[model samples]
Target: KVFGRCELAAAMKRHGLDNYRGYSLGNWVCAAKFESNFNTQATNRNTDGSTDYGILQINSRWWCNDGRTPGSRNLCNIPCSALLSSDITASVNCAKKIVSDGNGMNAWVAWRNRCKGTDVQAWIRGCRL
Candidate 1:
C-alpha cells in the first residue's frame, strides 16, 4: 500500500531524519539498502554488545539513551504498519535527508553508486533519488 504524506513524515521523524524536499522514493530505498537493508526491525550488536536497530539501523544508545520507548528507536517508531507503506517520491526525499544531513542531494547520489551499481559521478549528475 501507498503511504500518505503524513505517514512518510512520521517515518522521517521517527528515524531522526529530516523530511524530504525534492527527492524520490528510489533514492530513499537505495539509501535504506545501504544503511540497513530496509529492515525496520533489524538490530546488530557490537563486539562490546552495543546495539543498532530498525530500518535506519540507529544505534540504540545514541537514539534511546534516556528511557525512550520502542517508538523512539530509529525508524521503527513510525509504526510498522506505516513503514510497510510505500511511496517512491516520499521515500526518496526521506532517504536524501537521512544521508546528506540536508547537504543537498550528494549523499543520495553517492549512495546510489555504492549500492545501486551506478557510476558515482554519473549518478550524481542525473540522480533522481
Candidate 2:
C-alpha cells in the first residue's frame, strides 16, 4: 500500500494530520520523508535486535514485539509487522498517541535531526495540499 510522495502528503493532510498535537503537517511530512520515504514496507534492523516498522518506523522494542526486549508497553496494541503495510490506520493512530504522550516529534531521530526547528515546507512542497 505504498504511495507516491505527494499522494502521501495528500493522505496525511486528508487525515487531518497536519496539526495533530500541535505539530505542523510539514513536520510530519518531513519526518515521514526521512524515516521511510513514505514506503509502507520500509524496515531497519537495529543493532539491539529491534526493528523499526512502517512509515513512522515504530520501534519493535517499545511499541511492539515484546519478545526480544521484554516489558514492552505496546500502547497501540498492534504488532510491529502490522505497521509495515499500505494501510496506515494503525500507524497513524499510534503516532498521534505518541505525540499525546508528550514525546511530540522528538520520538523520531529523523524528526529531531531533519524536521525539527527547520523549515519543513519543502517536505511537502509540491503536494497540492
Candidate 3:
C-alpha cells in the first residue's frame, strides 16, 4: 500500500496531480481508497472478463495490455504489469492520459459509485493539503 490519505496527498502534489482539470486532491484520494486502498500492485477481475490494474484500477479494456486479459485495447500503450508497481510514475502518467481523454475521474467505477457526491471532504481532513 502506497497511501493512507495524508501521504497520498503529498505524493500526488509532488507528482503535479493536485487539482488537475478541476479535480481536488480529495477526489483522487477517495477514488484511490475505494479502488484498491492505494496498493499499486492491485488488480481486479471485472465481470466482463477484463481486469482492472494498479492504483487507479485502470481497465484492461481501455488503458492497458495484459495477455491474461484478451480484448484489451491498450489505449495507454502500457503493459498491465507496468502499472502494478510501487513507484507510481507510469501509473500517474497513464491516469493523466485517462483523465485528459474526456471521462475525467468518472472513468473509475469506484469514484462514480462512492465518491462522486458524498461527503468527500474527509478524504483530505487532517492531511494539511
Candidate 4:
C-alpha cells in the first residue's frame, strides 16, 4: 500500500509516533517520504548484505530478523517480512522501540539526511492533528 501523505500521518499518530521522542508527525512523514516514499512493500538491500524493510525502512541487521542478514540481532524480535504489510502497526511499534533505545530518529539515515534539522511543517501542512 502506498500511503497518502496525510493518511500516513494519522496512522502514525494512532500508533503514538507523533512527537514520540521530540520528533513530530512531520518528522516521521518526511523521513518516510525519503525512506520508502510511504510504500508498505518497500525494501532496500545494503552493501553490507542487510536489507531495509517497509515504510520506515527498518533494517535487517539490527531491528528485524530476516534470517539472512548475518549477525542479525533481531532487537525488535520481529520477522522482517512483517514490516512489509499494509498493516503498519508493527512497523510503528518497532520504530518507537528504536527511539526508546535512545537512537532517536537518527536510527534511520534517511531521516538524518533528508528530514533532520529542517522545517518539516509542510510535510504535515494541511493535516489537522
Candidate 5:
C-alpha cells in the first residue's frame, strides 16, 4: 500500500517512532518520503548486491536476512520478506533496532541527506492521531 504523508506519519507514530532514539516523528516521516515514497513493498538493490526493503528501506546486508546478501549478519533477526508487508510491524521494529544501534537516523542515507537538521514539521502537520 502506498500511504499519503499524514497517513505514513500516523503509522510511524503508532509504531513508537515518535521521538524514537531522539529523532522526531517528522524525521521518520520525512525519511520515508525519500526512502520509498510510503510504498510498503518498496525494494532497492545496491551496487554491492545487497537489497533494501520496505517503506523505511531496511537493508539485507545488516538489518534483514534475504538469503542472498553475501555474509549478511541479519542483525534484526527478521526475514527480509517480512519487511515488505503492509503490516509494518516488522519494518518498524527493525527500524527501531537499526537506530538503536548507535546510528540514530543516520542508518538511512535518505534521512541523513533529506531529513537531517531540516524543519520537518510539514511532514506531520495534520497527522495528529
Candidate 6:
C-alpha cells in the first residue's frame, strides 16, 4: 500500500505539481517503493546511517545533514520524525527536488547500479509498494 498519501499529495501540491508528468506522483511512488519500501522509519545502520533513511531512504548526511549532529539545521533537527508530521510534504518535496534536480538521483543511480543491475525504469518494478 502507499504510505503518506496525503503528505505526498501535499508535497506535490506545494511544488505546483498539480499535473503529473514524467517524474510525477506515480514516478515518486514507484521510486519510493524501490528505495525504501515506503517505510518512513527505514534506516541503514550498516552504512553508519550514511546511505539512506525514511520512506524515500534519503541520504540523511548528504542531502539534509548529520543525524547525530546538534545544530538546528542539522539532520538531528529534522530527523526521521519529519515524516510523521502533517507538513511532511516539505521533506518529500525537498527529496523530490534533489532527485530530479540532478544531485540526489546520481547517488540513486549509483546504488541501483550496484544493488539492482536493471535500468532505472525497470527498477521501479521491484518495489511493489
Off by over 4 Å in 4: none
Candidate 3 lDDT over 5-104, as tens digits, reads 7887777767767788777778888888899899888989999888898888988888899877776698889998888888777778888899888889
In model 4, where is the ten-residue run with the lowest total lDDT? 120-129
Sum up the clashes in candidate 6: 1
Superposition error at 83 for model 6 (Å): 3.8
Question: Per-residue lDDT tens digits of candidate 6, residues 39-65?
Answer: 566556424535455666666555555
Model 3 residue runs over 4 Å out of place are: none
What clash count does candidate 3 reach?
Answer: 0
| Per-model TM-score versus the true fold | 0.37, 0.89, 0.91, 0.96, 0.96, 0.53
lDDT of each residue in 23-114, candidate 1, tens digit only: 43344444555555655544565444435444444444323221333334433223322322343333333344354555544443335455
Q: Give a tens-digit lDDT track for model 4, residues 2-51.
A: 99999999898889998898888899999899999999899999989999
Per-model RMSD to reference: 8.7, 1.7, 1.4, 0.9, 0.8, 6.1
Would you give me the overall lDDT of model 4? 0.92
**Model with the higher lDDT, candidate 1 or 5:** 5
Model 2: pairs clashing at backbone N, Cα or C within 3 Å: 1-86, 18-25
Q: All models: lDDT? A: 0.41, 0.81, 0.84, 0.92, 0.91, 0.50
State the weakest 10-residue window (summed lDDT) of model 6: 69-78
For model 5, residues 1-129, the per-residue Cα lDDT tens digits are 898999888888889999988888999899988999999899999988999999999999998999999987898899999999988889999999999998799889999999898998778987666
How large an RMSD does model 3 have? 1.4
For model 2, what is the error of residue 85's alpha carbon versus the real structure, in angstroms, after optimal superposition? 1.5
Alpha-carbon runs more than 4 Å astray in model 5: none
Clashing residue pairs found in predicted model 6: 53-57
